């Protein structure tokens, strides 16, 4: 047998080979099986020699290769063959496919798709023969014979795959499927087959096996459909984390789904980094463009994804621009969809991007290292563009929001991940330490948050050591905010705490002066934080009990600090001032300092008092002025010297009673009586006398606070009181804001006194002030100033001032002895303040909302509309009752209140119904002739509407009554004709706006009709809005202008929404909805329009902007009407 095919293959083609196979027929099976079992090497020529004896110029030769071809497939995979035999039997049979006929090749592959169905082949071995199958088919163009002929190599090879396509593939074998489409050259059909198929799968495998799997499609990708693949792999994983999600909301998963995921991430970046375009078409397909993709595009698994990427140099730019411009996109969007009805009806809201990037921190505790680094590094990217800028050089709701997210993926991410704490720190720190005048204080605060998070990690921290040598070099608003949020370090780390002592030590001797005030707010700092224990009798700590641990702080600690701090009160008056302020502070926390502080102040006013009992000017002023060449300068604020020592006493007397003290307490109980007594009795030489007018005026300003707080009781201190007024309102008269010397607590205190407090014993305390009654008025003047200065700055000048917790509270106290005395001109005073306080309450304390309302008696709507109608009740009797001219002013700060309170309504409620109605009701049985008033009550009526229905109601209906009350060439021509008019063309242009965005969202998807219709209305009753306008006469100056920048606008619109019709109907019927309203203009706009601008050259004696607006306009509908169905615009000429 073996020996006689040896000659044949040795001696010549056809006569000698193909006649031996003619003899056989028989057993090539149970030879070839048994003859590789005795060599395999004898079988390994054993083909050539019979496949050259086959050839395809004979069919006996053919359509036997046939059956050889199937034998050494059927032993390739059952058989135990080693894998030298078995890979070169499929070595051959690769190398020798070449020239059968198309007939065949076509069987030979349905046999393999035959093995697919079901099979236990072990091996795939057999499929590395498809690829070369397929692809020979391919090469002839012709028709073949099989069955209906009919069908060239490239057609078989199609409906081939194609039938593999559509068989299941084993669990096991699916890889090596997927591999041997590696080698075969596609269709784009035939790829999006092969892929989409595959895909198919993945949801029927366990997850451990799908990042093999998904890296040999990868490869496929390479030839082929990248953003099919993506999108898929993609798709998959974003719906898989849904029902994850969803998991949560009701460890067990996340191990392997995250684990898997990264493993996944991992694999497709791989792929990005072979392959460009793959990464390019990454980022193709991600990219937002029109925001109804976005919302959609990115999902937390896809971010994870081009976080990775961001590891690829290359594609860091863009990874970074796609986020940072998707999370303003997300933001601005959604803080569009909670203005308009009309927009949540229409579209549903979305998870936005903030929210998602964040789940990608969370999720990436599980084995996401590749995701952090440009986790970090894209959070301060946000930090640094959206950070303040301007505010510190003389919406930004996104630039905010921005930012904060920017601190919150930077904060979260250091405390999920520890090997990065580090770098964090290291990176905030330096831009710090670093950053010019551009505001730093968002960093601070993360800074501070880091800290606050887990003081224990940074205790040693030489980074936050190192940073304070910088401390003189930075500025003074910097220092502070470093020290403030370091504190809890300097609690523990005993050689951070002396390394700033140190510091601090030598950069009191700057020459500079925000050196030296800088190095004044640390020790200030220092002593809040730090105790003694010395040879004595909040828990701050104990710097001196281990002598061996600190080389700096000894049981002096304290005093030596004071002693130093005392060399600043000779020093320039900003900061003494700036020492007075602290030494309260101190004291307060501190009680061992009360003796060394007090002495302090005590000898400096010894400086400025005249101690000859009844010399009249019972202090010194012309100390309290320096001058030096030219310059006069004020040194020793006077009036808070005075202030602290009466804060002080105020609080010895009040706290400490559990020697030397008590005799300096007393003594200067007598200097301030004394003072109290004594007391009542542009260039050079004139801005010297200006600063102690002012002096004075505190001076008095806080003897007044002293000489309460003294006693609460005598009327014979009260006759004081009011002549310390009678001097503080001589010397206002003589000649004021921020300079209210009172400090908070007691501008509380004593507007609770006078107003609520009657039930004490004296009606004499109140008549003392009550009579004089612009002291009545001054006492309301520095509350509502103090609270309005609250706006201006967080702070407050005296005591308790920057303190939020004291703050809120004295506004609690202050606000309903306010609401008591509007309840019952001073009470117009009490309005305007009371309004004040709302709006401070809201826009800074909001979270204390709830707390808020409550001092002043679902909930916290319930407050609300509790308070609006106490309020909306008195500006209805303040119209029912109203007599001839009234008020403009109570009216227009009492809606103020109003439409201040309506926000804290839900939009939902019954109780936002009670405002939004309500208003509506003033609308329309209401006028009046000052048009301060109807704006507001418009914008207040609006502002409630339009989160009720879409405003086009009010606006068509508003026109009507302007239209019908002007011109044609409730109210009134005062009313409506300047004013009026610019509201409702202002909100109708909003209302465009909206539709704008509808009809670019539409158009970005390449439940939509349902839009589309509702859009139609809108545009429809905007257009009978108009037209009542367009005819009507309105003063030339601006409403004119107005008018005709809204208008062009609508026209600007319904091109937008007719050139999406041209893109719409490309695809298609124009239904009736869109035919009838586009003449509808044409016929109430058009001509009406042409008309209203001889109105205005007719009078007279932006123009330009209106006609080319219609003229684009009807340009589109030109082309719109000729290429789609309807003469519409041959109907809009007649």
Not at 834 to 841: A, D, R, W, Y
Not at 1018 to 1038: D, I, K
Not at 1042 to 1057: D, E, N, P, R, V
Request: glycine fraction near 4%; hydrophobic fraction near 40%; charge should be neutral.
């Amino acid at each position: 047998m073996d020996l006689k095919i040896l000659s044949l293959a040795t001696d010549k083609t056809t006569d000698k080979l193909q006649e031996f196979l003619q003899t056989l027929k028989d057993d090539d099976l149970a030879s070839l099986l048994q003859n590789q079992a005795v060599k395999g090497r004898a079988v390994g020529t054993l083909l050539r020699a019979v496949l050259k004896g086959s050839p395809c110029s004979e069919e006996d030769g053919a359509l036997r290769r046939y059956k050889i071809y199937s034998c050494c497939i059927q032993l390739v995979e059952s058989g135990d063959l080693q894998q030298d035999v078995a890979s070169e039997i499929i070595g051959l049979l690769m190398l020798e496919v070449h020239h059968f006929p198309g007939p065949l090749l076509v069987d030979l592959a349905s046999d393999f798709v035959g093995a697919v169905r079901e099979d236990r082949l072990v091996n795939g071995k057999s499929l590395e023969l498809l690829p070369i199958i397929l692809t020979a088919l391919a090469t002839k163009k012709e028709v073949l014979a099989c069955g209906k002929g009919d069908l060239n190599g490239e057609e078989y090879k199609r409906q081939l795959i194609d039938t593999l396509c559509s068989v299941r593939w084993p669990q096991r074998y699916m890889i090596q499927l997927t591999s041997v489409f590696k080698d075969v050259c596609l269709t784009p059909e035939e790829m999006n087959l092969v892929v989409a198929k595959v895909l198919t799968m993945f949801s029927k495998l366990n997850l451990q096996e799908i990042p093999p799997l998904v890296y040999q499609l990868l490869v496929l990708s390479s030839k082929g459909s990248r953003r099919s693949v993506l999108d898929g792999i993609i798709a998959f994983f974003r719906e898989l984390d849904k029902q994850h999600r969803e998991e949560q909301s009701s460890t067990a998963p996340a191990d392997e789904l995250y684990h898997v995921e990264g493993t996944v991430i991992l694999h497709i970046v791989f792929a990005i980094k072979l392959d460009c375009e793959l990464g390019r078409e990454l980022l193709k397909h991600l990219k937002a463009g029109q925001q109804g993709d976005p919302s959609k595009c990115l999902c937390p698994f896809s971010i994870a994804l081009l976080l990775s990427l961001t590891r690829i140099q290359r594609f860091e730019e863009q990874v970074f621009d796609l986020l940072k411009t998707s999370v303003v996109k997300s933001f601005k969007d959604l803080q569009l969809l909670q203005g308009s009805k009309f927009l949540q009806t229409l579209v549903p809201q979305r998870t936005c991007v903030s929210t998602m990037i964040l789940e990608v921190v969370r999720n990436s505790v599980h084995s996401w290292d590749h995701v952090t680094q440009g986790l970090i590094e894209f959070g301060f990217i946000l930090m640094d563009s959206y950070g303040p800028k301007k505010i510190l050089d003389g919406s930004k709701m996104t630039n905010q929001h921005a930012c904060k997210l920017g601190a919150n993926i930077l904060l979260e991410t250091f405390k999920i991940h520890e090997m990065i704490r580090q770098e964090i720190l290291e990176q905030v720190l330096n831009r710090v330490v670093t950053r010019t005048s551009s505001p730093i204080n968002h960093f601070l605060d993360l800074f501070s948050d880091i800290i606050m998070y887990a003081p224990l990690i940074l205790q040693n921290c030489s980074k936050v050591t190192e940073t304070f040598d910088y401390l003189t070099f930075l500025p003074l608003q910097t220092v502070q905010g470093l020290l403030k949020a370091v504190q809890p370090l300097l609690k523990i780390s005993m050689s951070m705490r002396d390394s700033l002592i140190l510091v601090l030590r030598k950069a009191m001797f700057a020459s500079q002066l925000d050196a030296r005030k800088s190095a004044v707010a640390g020790f200030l700092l220092l002593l809040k934080n730090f105790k003694v224990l010395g040879s004595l009798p909040v828990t701050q700590v104990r710097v001196d009990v281990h002598s061996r641990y600190s080389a700096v702080a000894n049981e002096t600690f304290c005093l030596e600090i004071i002693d130093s701090l005392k060399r600043s009160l000779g020093q320039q008056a900003d900061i003494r001032l700036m020492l007075y302020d602290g030494f309260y502070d101190v004291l307060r926390r501190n009680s061992q300092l009360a003796s060394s502080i007090m002495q302090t102040l005590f000898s400096q006013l010894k400086q400025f008092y005249e101690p000859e009992p009844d010399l009249l000017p019972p202090l010194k002023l012309g100390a309290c002025v320096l001058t030096q060449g030219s310059q006069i300068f004020l040194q020793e604020p006077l009036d808070h010297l005075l202030s602290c020592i009466q804060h002080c006493l105020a609080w010895y007397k009040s706290r400490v009673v559990p020697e030397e003290e008590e005799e300096l307490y007393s003594e200067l109980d007598d200097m301030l009586e004394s003072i109290t007594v004594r007391m009542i009795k542009n260039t050079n030489v004139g801005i010297k006398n200006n600063i102690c007018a002012c002096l004075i005026m505190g001076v008095c300003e806080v003897l007044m606070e002293y000489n309460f707080s003294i006693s609460n009781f005598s009327k014979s201190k009260f006759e004081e009181i009011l002549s310390l007024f009678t001097c503080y309102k001589k010397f206002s008269d003589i000649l004021k804001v921020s300079d209210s010397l009172l400090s908070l607590k007691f501008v509380s205190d004593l507007l609770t006194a006078l107003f609520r407090d009657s039930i004490q014993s004296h009606e004499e305390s109140l008549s003392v002030l009550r009579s004089s009654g612009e002291f009545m008025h001054y006492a309301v003047n520095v509350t509502l100033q103090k609270i309005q200065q609250l706006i201006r700055t967080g702070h407050v000048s005296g005591p308790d001032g920057q303190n939020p917790d004291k703050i809120f509270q004295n506004l609690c106290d202050i606000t309903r002895v306010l609401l008591w005395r509007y309840t019952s001109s001073i009470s117009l005073l009490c309005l305007e303040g009371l309004q004040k306080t709302f709006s401070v309450v809201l826009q800074f304390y909001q979270p204390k909302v709830q707390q808020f309302l409550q001092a002043l008696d679902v909930t916290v709507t319930q407050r609300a509309s509790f308070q609006i109608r106490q309020f909306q009740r008195s500006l209805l009797n303040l119209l029912s009752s109203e007599e001839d001219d009234f008020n403009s002013k109570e009216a227009l700060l009492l809606i103020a209140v109003l439409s201040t309170l309506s926000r804290l309504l839900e939009p939902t409620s019954p109780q936002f119904v009670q405002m939004l109605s309500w208003t509506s009701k003033i609308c329309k049985e209401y006028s009046q002739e000052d048009a301060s008033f109807c704006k507001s009550l418009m914008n207040l009526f609006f502002s409630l509407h339009v989160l009720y229905k879409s405003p086009v109601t009010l606006l068509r209906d508003l026109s009507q009554d302007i239209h019908g009350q002007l011109g044609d060439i409730v109210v009134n021509l005062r009313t409506a004709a300047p004013t009026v008019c610019l509201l409702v063309l202002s909100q109708a242009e909003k209302v465009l706006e909206e539709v704008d965005w509808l009809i670019a969202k539409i158009k970005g998807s390449a439940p939509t009709l349902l839009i589309e219709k509702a859009i139609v209305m809108q545009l429809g009753t905007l257009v009978t809005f108009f037209h009542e306008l367009v005819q009507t006469a309105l003063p030339s100056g601006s409403c004119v202008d107005t008018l005709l920048k809204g208008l062009s606008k609508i026209y600007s619109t319904l091109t937008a929404f007719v050139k999406y019709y041209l893109q719409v109907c490309q695809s298609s019927g124009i239904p009736n909805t869109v035919e009838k309203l586009v003449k509808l203009s044409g016929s109430h706009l058009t001509p009406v329009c042409y008309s209203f601008i001889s109105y205005v050259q007719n009078k007279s004696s932006p123009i330009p902007n209106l006609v080319f607006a219609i003229e684009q306009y009807e340009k589109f509908l030109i082309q719109l009407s000729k290429k789609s169905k309807v003469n519409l615009m041959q109907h809009m000429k007649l």
